[PDB]
Enzyme design. Structure first.
Site, PDB file in Angstrom:
ATOM      1  N   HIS A 142       0.989  -1.128   0.397  1.00 19.70           N
ATOM      2  CA  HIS A 142       0.197   0.092   0.239  1.00 19.70           C
ATOM      3  C   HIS A 142       0.613   1.312  -0.414  1.00 19.70           C
ATOM      4  O   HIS A 142       1.316   2.049  -1.089  1.00 19.70           O
ATOM      5  CB  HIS A 142      -0.994   0.015   1.335  1.00 19.70           C
ATOM      6  CG  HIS A 142      -1.840   1.029   1.174  1.00 19.70           C
ATOM      7  ND1 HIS A 142      -3.093   1.018   1.375  1.00 19.70           N
ATOM      8  CD2 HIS A 142      -2.024   2.308   1.509  1.00 19.70           C
ATOM      9  CE1 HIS A 142      -3.275   2.691   1.462  1.00 19.70           C
ATOM     10  NE2 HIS A 142      -3.065   3.220   2.214  1.00 19.70           N
ATOM     11  N   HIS A 146       1.619   4.354  -3.514  1.00 20.92           N
ATOM     12  CA  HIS A 146       1.421   5.920  -3.485  1.00 20.92           C
ATOM     13  C   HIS A 146       2.510   5.765  -3.341  1.00 20.92           C
ATOM     14  O   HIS A 146       2.453   7.391  -4.811  1.00 20.92           O
ATOM     15  CB  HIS A 146       1.358   6.413  -1.641  1.00 20.92           C
ATOM     16  CG  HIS A 146      -0.114   6.294  -1.163  1.00 20.92           C
ATOM     17  ND1 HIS A 146      -1.015   6.033  -1.754  1.00 20.92           N
ATOM     18  CD2 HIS A 146       0.029   5.790   0.105  1.00 20.92           C
ATOM     19  CE1 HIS A 146      -2.036   6.580  -0.405  1.00 20.92           C
ATOM     20  NE2 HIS A 146      -1.519   5.681   0.298  1.00 20.92           N
ATOM     21  N   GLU A 166      -5.874   6.728  -1.780  1.00 21.88           N
ATOM     22  CA  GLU A 166      -5.895   5.198  -1.396  1.00 21.88           C
ATOM     23  C   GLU A 166      -6.990   3.789  -1.787  1.00 21.88           C
ATOM     24  O   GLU A 166      -5.490   2.839  -1.699  1.00 21.88           O
ATOM     25  CB  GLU A 166      -6.657   6.083   0.129  1.00 21.88           C
ATOM     26  CG  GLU A 166      -6.612   6.502   1.165  1.00 21.88           C
ATOM     27  CD  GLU A 166      -5.364   5.511   1.674  1.00 21.88           C
ATOM     28  OE1 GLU A 166      -4.168   6.024   1.366  1.00 21.88           O
ATOM     29  OE2 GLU A 166      -5.739   5.002   2.028  1.00 21.88           O
TER      30      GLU A 166
HETATM   31  C1  LIG Z   1       0.973  10.315   8.566  1.00 22.20           C
HETATM   32  C2  LIG Z   1      -0.244   9.841   7.360  1.00 22.20           C
HETATM   33  C3  LIG Z   1      -0.404   8.714   7.651  1.00 22.20           C
HETATM   34  C4  LIG Z   1      -1.443   7.992   6.315  1.00 22.20           C
HETATM   35  C5  LIG Z   1      -1.932   6.630   6.275  1.00 22.20           C
HETATM   36  N1  LIG Z   1      -1.101   6.308   6.154  1.00 22.20           N
HETATM   37  C6  LIG Z   1      -1.887   5.895   4.591  1.00 22.20           C
HETATM   38  O1  LIG Z   1      -2.910   5.767   3.639  1.00 22.20           O
HETATM   39  O2  LIG Z   1      -0.538   5.256   3.593  1.00 22.20           O
HETATM   40  N2  LIG Z   1      -1.060   9.192   6.031  1.00 22.20           N
HETATM   41  C7  LIG Z   1      -1.585   9.652   4.539  1.00 22.20           C
HETATM   42  N3  LIG Z   1      -0.707  10.356   6.552  1.00 22.20           N
HETATM   43 ZN   LIG Z   2      -2.218   5.350   2.406  1.00 21.60          ZN
END
Ligand SMILES: Cc1cc(CNC(=O)O)n(C)n1
Ligand SMILES: [Zn+2]
Ligand SMILES: Cc1cc(CN)n(C)n1
Ligand SMILES: [Ca+2]
Ligand SMILES: [Ca+2]
Ligand SMILES: [Ca+2]
Ligand SMILES: [Ca+2]
Length: 316
Positions: A142, A146, A166
């Site tokens: 995941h 990103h 997402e």
């Molecule tokens: C500080 C932080 C944690 C997350 C969740 N992580 C994700 O959705 O990969 N985000 C987007 N930002």
């Molecule tokens: Zn994410």
């Protein structure tokens, strides 16, 4: 660093033994030279300065408790690299074999993981909500997905485009989990979430409402929390992706499944050829329809199933 490629052994967060690609120069470093321009894993040492120090080990054995998050971040980054290369002919997140960097032991009791624009970052969890988050292959994939998105569609991390961002990470996180073929499922984070509770996870793609997330556009969140619901409204797209792959009847709309591999091909093509930074859900549907048309033909079952799946979740 400069050195010679070696193979260490260690145990991950869940206690499983695995081999890891390292580099020897005085110490053995978590530096895998076998993939692209390298996979590099760093120790953030419970602080928030990034990346921290490249992980160094005296004997190339990584069986200490403190080592486990690093073993898994390093290994699962490699698996994710292999998935993108072998399945989609994509060389690392930029398509040009960019070095992949991850830091573990970020902060204290940190119940999250993220891509910060330059690298992956993993908390250890507080031991109750999470154990160290790199223990989840879907979590690792995941996060790296990103990076793929940032170099391709560039979906802005807010509102509908952020929910697509997402969902893309959940989709490819799950497809990487299936690729590795260790206890695969359509849920997100089950291997590291709530060690005291069996059978739960952060999110479900097959039934997002299991954890309160919407499974139809009419149930979307439109407030301001969570960047406009990016981890909430992702359920609408995750459900459509699940239906495309596995099929089913949802709010009275029947979808003929076409399998995970074709799901991956359709959404990879959509992500890399048609989606833009401001794409909304309706535009994602069009991108997926066009991608399926390119790959399988306008009259194909694959195209028909994409349309049924988006119909089922109320996205026209
Ligand atoms: C500080 C932080 C944690 C997350 C969740 N992580 C994700 O959705 O990969 N985000 C987007 N930002
Ligand atoms: Zn994410
Ligand atoms: C999903 C979503 C959220 C919002 C406002 N924050 N909009 C307009 N759409
Ligand atoms: Ca050691
Ligand atoms: Ca699993
Ligand atoms: Ca999973
Ligand atoms: Ca649990």
């Amino acid at each position: 660093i400069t050195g010679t490629s070696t193979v260490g052994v260690g145990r991950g967060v869940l206690g499983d033994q695995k081999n890891i690609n390292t580099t020897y120069s005085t110490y053995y470093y978590l530096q895998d030279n076998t993939r692209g321009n390298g996979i590099f894993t760093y120790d953030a040492k419970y602080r928030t300065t990034l990346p921290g120090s490249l992980w160094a080990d005296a004997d190339n054995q990584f069986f200490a408790s403190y080592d486990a998050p690093a073993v898994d971040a390093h290994y699962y980054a490699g698996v994710t690299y292999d998935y993108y290369k072998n399945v989609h002919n994509r060389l690392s997140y930029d398509g040009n074999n960019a070095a992949i960097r991850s830091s573990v032991h970020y902060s204290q009791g940190y119940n999250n993981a993220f891509w910060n624009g330059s690298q992956m970052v993993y908390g250890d969890g507080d031991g109750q909500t999470f154990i160290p988050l790199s223990g989840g292959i879907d979590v690792v994939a995941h996060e790296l997905t990103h990076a793929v998105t940032d170099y391709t569609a560039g979906l802005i991390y807010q509102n509908e485009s952020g929910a697509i961002n997402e969902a893309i990470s959940d989709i490819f996180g799950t497809l990487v989990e299936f690729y590795a073929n260790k206890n695969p499922d359509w849920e997100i984070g089950e291997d590291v979430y709530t060690p005291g509770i069996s059978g739960d996870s952060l999110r479900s793609m097959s039934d997002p409402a299991k954890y309160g997330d919407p499974d139809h556009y009419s149930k979307r969140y439109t407030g301001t929390q969570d960047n406009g619901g990016v981890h909430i409204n992702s359920g609408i797209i995750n459900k459509a992706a699940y239906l495309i792959s596995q099929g089913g009847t949802h709010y009275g709309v029947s979808v003929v499944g076409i399998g995970r591999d074709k799901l991956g091909k359709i959404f990879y093509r959509a992500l890399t050829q048609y989606l833009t930074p401001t794409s909304n859900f309706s535009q994602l549907r069009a991108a997926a329809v066009q991608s399926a048309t390119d790959l399988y033909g306008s009259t194909s079952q694959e195209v028909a199933s994409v349309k049924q799946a988006f119909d089922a979740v109320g996205v026209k």
